[PDB]
Amino acid sequence: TIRYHEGDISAEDAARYKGAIAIDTETLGLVPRRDRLCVVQLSSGDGTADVIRIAAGQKQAPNLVHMLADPARQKIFHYGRFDIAVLFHTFGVTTTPVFCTKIASRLCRTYTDRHGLKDNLKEMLEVDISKAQQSSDWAAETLSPAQLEYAASDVLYLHALRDKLTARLIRDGRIEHADACFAFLPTRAKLDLLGWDETDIFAHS
Amino acid sequence: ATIRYHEGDISAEDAARYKGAIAIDTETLGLVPRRDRLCVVQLSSGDGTADVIRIAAGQKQAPNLVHMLADPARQKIFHYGRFDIAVLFHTFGVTTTPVFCTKIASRLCRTYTDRHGLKDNLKEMLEVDISKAQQSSDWAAETLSPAQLEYAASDVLYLHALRDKLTARLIRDGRIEHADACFAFLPTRAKLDLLGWDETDIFAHS
Amino acid sequence: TIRYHEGDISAEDAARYKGAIAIDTETLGLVPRRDRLCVVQLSSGDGTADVIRIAAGQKQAPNLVHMLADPARQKIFHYGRFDIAVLFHTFGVTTTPVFCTKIASRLCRTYTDRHGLKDNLKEMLEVDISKAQQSSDWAAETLSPAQLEYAASDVLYLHALRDKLTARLIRDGRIEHADACFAFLPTRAKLDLLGWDETDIFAHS
Amino acid sequence: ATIRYHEGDISAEDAARYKGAIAIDTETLGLVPRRDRLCVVQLSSGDGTADVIRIAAGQKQAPNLVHMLADPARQKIFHYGRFDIAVLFHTFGVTTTPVFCTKIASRLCRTYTDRHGLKDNLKEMLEVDISKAQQSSDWAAETLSPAQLEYAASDVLYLHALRDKLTARLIRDGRIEHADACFAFLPTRAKLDLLGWDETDIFAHS
Amino acid sequence: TIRYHEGDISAEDAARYKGAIAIDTETLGLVPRRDRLCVVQLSSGDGTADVIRIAAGQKQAPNLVHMLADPARQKIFHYGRFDIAVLFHTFGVTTTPVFCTKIASRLCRTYTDRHGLKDNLKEMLEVDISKAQQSSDWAAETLSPAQLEYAASDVLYLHALRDKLTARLIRDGRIEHADACFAFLPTRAKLDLLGWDETDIFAHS
Amino acid sequence: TIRYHEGDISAEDAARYKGAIAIDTETLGLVPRRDRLCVVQLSSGDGTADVIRIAAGQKQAPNLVHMLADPARQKIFHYGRFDIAVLFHTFGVTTTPVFCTKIASRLCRTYTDRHGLKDNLKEMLEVDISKAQQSSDWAAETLSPAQLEYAASDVLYLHALRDKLTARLIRDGRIEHADACFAFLPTRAKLDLLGWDETDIFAHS
Amino acid sequence: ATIRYHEGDISAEDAARYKGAIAIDTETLGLVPRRDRLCVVQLSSGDGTADVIRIAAGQKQAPNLVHMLADPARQKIFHYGRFDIAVLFHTFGVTTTPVFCTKIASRLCRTYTDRHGLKDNLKEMLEVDISKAQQSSDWAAETLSPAQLEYAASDVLYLHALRDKLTARLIRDGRIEHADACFAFLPTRAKLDLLGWDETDIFAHS
Amino acid sequence: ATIRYHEGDISAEDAARYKGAIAIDTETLGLVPRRDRLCVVQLSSGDGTADVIRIAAGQKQAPNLVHMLADPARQKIFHYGRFDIAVLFHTFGVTTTPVFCTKIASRLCRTYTDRHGLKDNLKEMLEVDISKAQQSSDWAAETLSPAQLEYAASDVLYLHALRDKLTARLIRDGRIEHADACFAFLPTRAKLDLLGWDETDIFAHS
Ligand SMILES: [Mn+2]
Ligand SMILES: [Mn+2]
Ligand SMILES: [Mn+2]
Ligand SMILES: [Mn+2]
Ligand SMILES: [Mn+2]
Ligand SMILES: [Mn+2]
Ligand SMILES: [Mn+2]
Ligand SMILES: [Mn+2]
Ligand SMILES: [Mn+2]
Ligand SMILES: [Mn+2]
Ligand SMILES: [Mn+2]
Ligand SMILES: [Mn+2]
Ligand SMILES: [Mn+2]
Ligand SMILES: [Mn+2]
Ligand SMILES: [Mn+2]
Ligand SMILES: [Mn+2]
After folding, report:
1. Residue C97: how many CB atoms within 10 A of its CB?
2. How far away, in angstroms, is D27 Cα from ligand 8 center?
3. DSSP annotation of C30
4. D74/chain A closest Cα distance in angstroms
């Protein structure tokens, strides 16, 4: 089931999130200063999701921004480097603390080169999601039923994926390395917005 | 004496000269830690003098130096600490912390140039001239040549002054918090290199 | 329905074009000084098309060239950079003014890398066209029925595609950037014919 | 006085010296406008003298200079205006027009060479010698060095004469209309760069 | 139908070739000094082919070599640059004169990038051949029926392909350019054997 | 049929190997100092296999290590360069002597670019194996039935593949070159562990 | 007189000096024939003197020179004739034949080096020193500078001697027949370049 | 006499000077053995003198030299023997064994540098200066120039001393067994090059 919102999540539906917050975003493209934030989706892990539609030029969302900046509740992304930069560009908020399931996948799933959400979900959870609506118009006047289902499917399994990946990082001894990556991720995202988006700051160049 | 020479470990007396930040560099047999052994460790307190410590083959202990490296009350200054931190962890098992990297700081504030080596940084920021001719030499040699000893000392003699200059630039241009976060992740970046992620950015897609 | 012509469109069938002119060409290849113009197709947007067969060495087509140079009627291409250069190389005419639906696609469809006509037509218009006859012999002595249908299908939907893309450029605020691109397109095509065809003149090299 | 120094904006008296085309260049902290702030704006009327205007950090207004930049009755001469036009639009919100780019003109008529930088263009077309040693310096410095001031002025002192030489070449070789169309699209090319199309030709397939 | 021979074609079956000779070879690989010639197939254009099995170290084939060096009978290859070098390396014979249908394809079929035999045969002749046996062991003790059928299919249509391509080169005005290419082809092949196999001798380097 | 072992092969099941030993390994990835050895599989060529599960941090396996270092029994790998390095990294043993069927494939199957085990097995032996379980979690608490079947299938045909490839190396005269490659292979693997893993030591750089 | 200057075409008297092979080079406005016009044609009979012929813009006729170019009884010597043959065919419609290319000959017999330019070939084979500084100049200039005239003449003054030296090398190393076949295909190679195959080898798969 | 010249083969008297290892290099017409013929073979016993043997065109026999090359009781020292071993096998059919390659040894122990050429190795290990100017010359020349003869001799005069220096480094850094295995495979590596595997590592996946 999906709860649809315009502009911001209701304070009522924000209270359902008493722990970690699974979160994803939908934009018009991969360049934040060019392609505006259109949708942000949330899920508390109970099999339901909140889908919030963002309007052009909208620069505030009090209930959502409070959840994002809340240091007592962890935020779960799959490749948070992009979403953290977009949310900071749109609302000026620094999402923290974070768990990135793609960084976790790269650190423990060393036997494969597939670290996208789709391949992670079927190997670790035996869950099949579709990638058909990823390249659609997320700024449409009316989000299609398939678009709303795709957006929710991006957050409905992030809690369970994090738990399975965390057990792998424990088994293979890289949980501290992953924790250090999550602490730097907000800085990595802010460095992307400033023009270092295609260079590793820790390299020689 | 401008250069204090030590065999195996720094003396406790000279280790007491370091009441604050410690400038540090290393010399190895190459750029692969699991292949090329650590040969020299050079330190400087910033007063124009340096300690040069010769590391023997197969040596896995240096308690006086290792204590300074792990001491969270004294900051360690490197130029491209990503490599040296990895060599020190591979050799002694010590995680150097906390660190300041003048190369990361240079890439974050000297945005008008692509020259981020130590020689170029010392030339612009401090008008100091150093030569890099002895970097490709046998650092495991029987006896280190005098030219080798001066190159090793000159690699740490100006790191204090360079850090001060670059810190003022990061504060002026508003990226001191970005650099501090980079320094906190640097020991993890080095440990990921030792594990085989040395040629990939862990924060990228692939 | 398709109206076939040899050498030039009839003055009768040119009068059906009281507004924008959808236009495409078919050649023997992508190098204009090597591969001759074989077919030029037109459509006024009513669901019908004129298909004009061009003979080797033919250097004039009065009714068509008058339409191309007419500044009161807009010409619609999908990737006009190629067709404008070919028409200028064959007839010495500078087609103006132009609307390029591929430039428009690149400027507003920022969520995808597919900017060809086929993917544009199905997303924006839900229209499916075949690309089977694109790599055929367009200098054949008799154009096949499939060739004539492929040629017409390249212009039958350019009016409706332009309208949908224009609404997107309006919604996303890049209609002035697209208009500036269309004004430079004839110069970009002429620069290609002179040997700058593989370099961006606005770059350092 | 060969160099007129200004703080923040050009004086109204010196702005009156520009009755025709305005040669113009900028100095920044780097090549990324959203990261590297605008530091200096240099102008020259073509009489051998230059105005050098220091731009403060966070400054978003310069009415006397901005009026000259937007004035459609006076042409602005750049060398690679694609970058400067973007920096000026990002800093002041002004769309510089109309413009002449001696680099675009050089690439369109000097077809016998791949050297299209300003130094090479001034050497062949005018036999003028300029040095580029100070381009990689701190242009946000506390006080601009005299070598910095002369480099900044020399970047605009010859743009009038270079434009005249290249215009005669474009007329002779029959591509003045191609260059004029390139100049008309240049402000859009710069704005597309600021939006993230900076490393792609919008007129290509991909 | 296929006529099988060991070592050399019979003088009887060589007399069936009163005109152009379609010819192809099969080897153990693409490096002539490493991978030996295993099979050479011939066809006179009547729908039948001679398939000659070559033994290891065999350095003579009088009836075949006489056909190859015969200047009165044209030899047809598809990409003769390879086969001419192999035949010269094995028997010391310089095949001349030649018609290469791949060079002809590259010169007149300017609307496509597919210049292999398979795509040439279906577009120009509406003939479908299989490429399944191309990467098999041609030095096997017994050539399989599929291997013999694949080898013959490489020469059964070279006459008809040459005729259709020659008409295209005539129509598009590059028949003299193709003739000049065929005259240089034996030198191009000999230059390959000497180590210039990966550089264009007419370039700067 | 498959014989499962934990930690080491039983001395009873080691006595079944009176000749060459087919052997493969399964790891958590391709970097030995990062990805631990999980499984090593053996087969004597009778159609049955021993599958030994290796525990994390386990640094000894007496019965297996004795087989690996036994100079009187040849060890057969497909691409032994990787497995020899992993076994030397885990147990400190130098496997010798070895026959690598991938080196043999590259030296005699000169007509193809496919030198993996799957393509080698179907061409030379007409045997079809699946590659589905290659990218699985080999450090799982319980190896799946499909994982155990995949692991055994990697060694069940190495004897027969070696024999067929050895006959090809004899026929084409490169058996001495292959023998020289096998003698250097343990050094090539040890050079990989020391950081020369992406450079050919015999090149200029 | 070491350099004979001509406007438009070589005089009939000076054309009579060429009883055998003709060394020839051209100067253009660039490397794209359909964009960059032919400016100068230089010839030399091998006696230490050269004819330098200035080609006007839009000129499509030069009967005295064109006759020498098409004359199958006199061989034309180029260094990288692939380009010049294309420029001459595009400008005058003449197919230069027969030709000898000292660059193709150099690549076929000087197998011990990668330096196949004219300057390197003249240095090793003849110990002649020529400079290439004037190759990137305005050859359509109002008046050709004296340095331009000497560079143009020096490009043809030694082609006879270089051809003789390289021919003896091709005969010695057994590749004179390979070079002769390359020379016979060269006019077709140039015409394929003018048609858009300029960046592909027609004898390759793609 | 510092250089002993021979035509076709080394004399039996001078071949008797080699009681131990034989330093050896070759000069060819290029880097492709099947195209570029062997021209010179240079040997040195390590006493400061060298034998320089001119190889005629089409020559396929040199019994005195070939016996030294195949002699398993005397080691042959090359710098990058991979090429010379291939040229010798292609020319005479001899498999040179056993061999020591100072380049392979340099890449295995001089891990602090990327400069593994002979000139750089002689400069660091022995402080000997040699020039490489004559490597790109006509070694099939009518008469070898004196500069050619000295370059050829200097390529073998120091291989004994260089091998001794590098052997001590391999023993010190623990990779003498790796180098010995590389030397044993080297003749096979060269023969694979002659068969068309010259641009691929046979030990890689592809
Ligand atoms: Mn998503
Ligand atoms: Mn996402
Ligand atoms: Mn360092
Ligand atoms: Mn250092
Ligand atoms: Mn079309
Ligand atoms: Mn089109
Ligand atoms: Mn500028
Ligand atoms: Mn400037
Ligand atoms: Mn075939
Ligand atoms: Mn073939
Ligand atoms: Mn396996
Ligand atoms: Mn394996
Ligand atoms: Mn030339
Ligand atoms: Mn020239
Ligand atoms: Mn050598
Ligand atoms: Mn040499």
Report:
1. 16
2. 5
3. S
4. 32
Q: Which helix (H) or strand (E) holds G53?
A: strand G50-54
Query: Which chain H residues in 110-139 lie under 8 Å from chain B, judged by CB atoms?
Result: 111-113, 115, 124
What is the CA(E25)–ligand 9 centre distance, in A? 6
Question: What is the rounded distance in angstroms from the CA atom of residue D154 to the CA atom of residue D139?
Answer: 15
Rounded CA gap, A138 and A142, in Å? 9
Task: Tell if the CB–CB gap between F29 and A110 is shorter than 8 Å.
Answer: yes
With beta carbons less than 8 A apart as the criterion, state whether A124 and A161 touch.
Answer: yes
Q: Name the token pair of C32.
A: 């204009």
Residue H28 phi, psi (nearest 5) = -130, 180
- DSSP lists the bridge partners of residue H101 as H78
Q: D119: burial class by Cβ within 10 Å (0-12, 13-18, 19+)?
A: middle
Phi-psi category of residue A4: left, alpha or beta, with phi > 0 → left and psi -120 to 50 → alpha: beta
Query: How far apart are alpha carbons G29 and F116 in whole angstroms?
Result: 55
Q: Do G206 and E79 touch (CB under 8 A)?
A: no
DSSP B101-139: EHHHHHHHH-TT-S--SHHHHHHHHT------TTSSS-T
Which residue from F8, B33, F29, F51 is spatially nearest to A172, judged by alpha carbons? F29
**Bridge-based pairing state of the strands D38-44 and D22-28:** antiparallel
Give me the number of domains chain A comprises.
1
Q: What is the dihedral of CA F122, F127, F128, F133, to 10 degrees?
A: -110
Q: From the CA of H177, how far away is ligand 13's center (Å)?
A: 56
Q: Quick check: H185 and F181 CB within 8 A? A: yes
Distance CA F132, CA G36 (A): 59
Q: Are A178 and A169 in contact (CB under 8 A)?
A: yes
- Angle at Cα B153 formed by Cα B148 and Cα B158, nearest 5°? 140
Which residues in chain A have their CB less than 8 angstroms from residue C110's CB? 28-29, 31, 34-35
Whether the upstream peptide bond of residue D63 has omega within 30° of 0, thus cis, is no
Nearest Cα neighbor of E151 from E179, E175, E177, E132 is E132
Q: What is the rounded distance in angstroms from the CA atom of residue D53 to the CA atom of residue D65?
A: 9
Do the strands E98-100 and E75-77 form a parallel or antiparallel pair, or are they unpaired?
parallel
Of H111, H115, H124, the CB nearest to B36: H111
Sheet holding E49-53, edge to edge: E2-6, E49-53, E37-43, E21-27, E75-77, E98-100
Residues in CB range of H135: below 8 A, 6 or more apart: H151
Strands A75-77 and A98-100: parallel
Query: Which of chain A's residues have a Cβ under 8 Å away from the Cβ of B191?
Result: 177
Residues of chain H contacting residue F115, judged by C-beta atoms under 8 Å apart: 205-206
Of G82, G184, G191, the CB nearest to E202: G82
Q: Identify whether the C-beta of residue B61 lies closer than 8 Å to the C-beta of residue B10.
A: no
Residue A156 Cα to ligand 1 middle (Å):
11
Cβ separation A137–C111 shorter than 8 A: yes
| Residue H46 Cα distances to H75, H96, H124, angstroms | 13, 19, 19
CB distance from A140 to chain C under 8 Å? no
CA dist H28 and H39 (Å) reads 5
Which chain D residues touch G29 with a CB distance below 8 Å? 111-112, 173
- The answer to whether H190 faces chain F, any CB pair under 8 Å, is no
Q: Closest-CA residue in chain C for E113?
A: C135
Distance from CA of residue C163 to its chain's centroid?
Answer: 16
Q: How many CA atoms lie within 13 A of A139 on its CB side?
A: 21
Q: State which residues form the domain around C144.
A: 1-205
Nearest CA in chain G to H38: G112
Tell me the resolution in Å: 2.3
